[PDB]
Structures are given as structure tokens and as C-alpha cells.
Design a protein around this ligand. Structure first.
Ligand SMILES: [Cl-]
Ligand SMILES: [Cl-]
Ligand SMILES: [Cl-]
Length: 376
């Protein structure tokens, strides 16, 4: 049985976790947390990297960091994971959905400005499949209207846009280390990346349960106190040690996934040039991370038939997002501005193929040959 995903395994995780257990300090903000956060700061360039329990928690932390208030409007795609919306609705935001581009399934940057109102406070681009949104256009829009930009870079660890690491471009960026993403912190995890230097101090306060604890450890105050509403956005140092093993192998993993990605593209390009399917687009300025390999079929019937075909060959391929805006909570918490030209239509024909670090070359060729048989 060929699964859709298997978590990355590097072969050093156990050793690093054992080392963490030898230190006797497994709670958050430990030695391996510092190592991972320093690595992201050094290699990606953010002002502060902060490990969290999940990308969901990182997104919630960003909404709280931005002091989102009831009635504030947050612009985001409808074609994204539910947590992108929840994080802001939890702070009372109304969600303003904007259609996606057909070529990359990312929010259409040429549609964001038309959705801005005097209540708009932030824009949340989602880098679908590790392919960056058109960030220069989005930052220019946000600066013209004095909006925060929050990157949902859950799928974009090691991705770049014009040489810049995804997650370091907006004011705040969020990573996911769930076992289905490129790197995993032992099953679950996330990171908030603070790129606006004026937000670092507040980020440290809300992450530390609303206290100026980090400021006390720095020696700037005699004692710390409860000074704001906060939460606990901490990863265990056990999970940070698992993550470190993976981050130490960051390029190894990235290069393996990219090579696998390119075998899919080579094999399926003829079916695309014949117009039977559509393959992913990777715009010139975008350095992808092979988070997924998706294809688009004619419609949901074509998609369903291919998935059930692959299932009968014991290959697990899956579709992705259902548009948030036409879900019951989406109609309650948000509105879709402008026409839904591509969000529903394109979501209904997209299928994702098995892709993961340890996917064998033999299993991959089995997937390819089953696909070719279906279209033959
Ligand atoms: Cl601003
Ligand atoms: Cl097509
Ligand atoms: Cl085969």
C-alpha cells in the first residue's frame, strides 16, 4: 500500500532526544529550542524565531500580537486551511475572502486592493504548495494602506521568493512542523517568525503567558509580572530536539523532495501538453520546496474517478481544500468579495500525489505507471 505521506525520518532523532533527556530540561525554551530558533534566525533572517505547538498556534499568536479586535477585517484566500481563518475569528475578526489565481492557487494579488475597507487591518497570503504568493505586490499594497501582512508559510519551510526565505517577508510569518509537512517536530509543532522589529517585545510577552519573563532573564527588570493577556505558545524541548535532527538535514530533505517532484513532472508533461491534465506552475521568482505535487483534472467527476482508480491499485492520492467561504462557519464568519471564478472550480479538480522524503523510487514509478494507465 503506497500512502500519500510518511513523516520525514533522518536517522538521528533518537540520539538528539536522548541527549535532551540527559540534560534533564524538557520544557519549552530549552537548549534545543534555542538551537532551532538560532538556526532559523541565522539561515532565514527573521528578527526572532519562536517555536510553538503548531502552525495553528503560531497563527493565533500573530492575530493576538496584532491586537485584532471585533469587527476588524482580515483579507485571506478562501482556498486555504481552516486554521488560517480560525486564528483571526477567535479574536473577533470578520474574514474577507478573495479569489485565487488559476496558475498557482495562491491569492490573486491583483484582487486584494478592491477588498480593502476602513476596517481592514491585515492580509494573510498563503504560500500554496510551497510556491510563494506575489509578495512584492502584496507588501506594496499593505504599505499603501498601513496593513499588517501575515504569511501563512505552513507549507513553505525552505521555500524562497527572490532569494528571501518564505516566512521572513511579511511582518509576521508562521511555519508548520506537522508530520505531513516537510520537517516535523516529532509530529506537531510550529514557529512564529517576527520580521517587524517593533513587534518582538510584544511577541515575547504574549508567548510567555502575558509576563515580561524574557525581559527578566535579560537582566532589564528586577522581577517580572503579569502585564498583558497572553497564552502558552511553547514547544517542548523534546520536540525541538526531533526538529533539530530534521533542520540539520534541511537541504538533504529539500533536494530529495525536489528530485522526486521533478520525476512526476517529467513523466506527466506529455499528458499536460496534450491538454488532458494541468501541472503546477512555479513562477520565475519562486523557489519551491516540493511540499506537494498536484495535478488538475477536468472536473470533480474526473478527479473522483482517478482517486478511486488509484485506490484500487493501493495508491492513496487525495484532494485538498474545500473552500472555506461556502462552509457553514465561513458564511457566518466571513464574506467572499468579488466573483468566485477559480476558488470553487479549481479546488474541485485538484488531486495531490504521494510525495514525501522517504518515498522510494520504485513506489514513485508505480504511481506514475498507474496514472499513465488511467489516461491511456
Ligand atoms: Cl502597519
Ligand atoms: Cl485540464
Ligand atoms: Cl508498477
Amino acid at each position: 500500500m503506497i500512502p500519500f505521506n510518511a513523516p520525514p525520518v533522518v536517522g538521528t532523532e533518537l540520539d538528539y532526544m536522548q541527549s535532551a533527556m540527559n540534560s534533564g530540561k524538557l520544557c519549552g525554551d530549552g537548549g534545543f529550542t534555542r538551537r532551532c530558533q538560532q538556526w532559523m534566525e541565522q539561515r532565514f533572517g527573521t528578527a526572532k524565531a519562536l517555536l510553538t505547538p503548531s502552525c495553528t498556534a503560531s497563527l493565533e499568536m500573530a492575530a493576538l500580537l496584532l491586537d485584532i479586535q471585533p469587527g476588524d477585517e482580515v483579507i485571506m484566500p478562501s482556498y486555504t486551511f481552516v486554521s488560517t481563518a480560525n486564528a483571526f475569528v477567535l479574536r473577533g475578526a470578520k474574514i474577507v475572502f478573495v479569489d485565487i489565481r488559476r496558475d498557482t492557487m495562491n491569492i490573486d494579488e491583483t484582487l486584494i486592493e478592491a477588498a480593502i475597507t476602513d476596517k481592514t487591518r491585515a492580509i494573510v497570503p498563503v504560500h500554496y504548495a510551497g510556491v510563494a504568493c506575489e509578495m512584492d505586490t502584496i507588501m506594496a499594497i499593505a504599505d499603501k494602506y498601513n496593513l499588517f501582512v501575515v504569511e501563512d508559510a505552513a507549507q513553505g519551510v525552505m521555500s524562497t521568493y527572490k532569494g528571501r526565505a518564505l516566512g521572513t517577508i511579511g511582518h509576521i510569518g508562521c511555519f508548520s512542523f506537522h508530520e505531513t509537512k516537510n520537517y516535523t517536530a516529532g509530529g506537531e509543532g510550529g514557529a512564529t517568525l517576527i520580521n517587524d522589529r517593533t513587534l518582538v517585545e510584544r511577541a515575547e510577552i504574549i508567548r510567555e503567558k502575558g509576563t515580561n519573563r524574557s525581559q527578566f532573564f535579560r537582566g532589564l527588570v528586577d522581577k517580572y509580572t503579569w502585564r498583558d493577556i497572553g497564552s502558552s505558545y511553547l514547544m517542548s524541548d523534546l520536540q525541538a530536539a526531533y526538529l533539530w535532527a530534521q533542520l540539520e538535514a534541511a537541504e538533504r530533505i529539500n533536494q530529495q523532495r525536489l528530485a522526486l517532484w521533478q520525476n512526476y513532472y517529467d513523466a506527466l508533461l506529455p499528458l499536460a501538453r496534450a491538454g488532458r491534465i494541468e501541472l503546477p506552475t512555479v513562477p520565475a521568482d519562486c523557489g519551491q520546496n516540493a511540499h506537494m505535487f498536484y495535478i488538475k483534472l477536468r472536473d470533480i467527476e474526473d478527479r473522483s474517478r482517478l482517486i478511486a482508480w488509484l485506490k484500487e491499485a493501493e495508491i492513496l492520492a487525495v484532494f485538498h481544500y474545500i473552500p472555506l467561504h461556502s462552509c457553514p462557519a465561513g458564511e457566518q464568519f466571513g464574506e467572499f468579495r468579488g466573483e468566485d471564478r477559480y476558488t470553487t472550480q479549481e479546488s474541485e479538480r485538484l488531486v495531490r500525489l504521494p510525495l514525501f522524503y522517504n518515498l522510494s523510487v520504485v513506489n514513485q514509478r508505480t504511481v506514475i505507471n498507474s496514472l499513465l494507465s488511467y489516461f491511456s
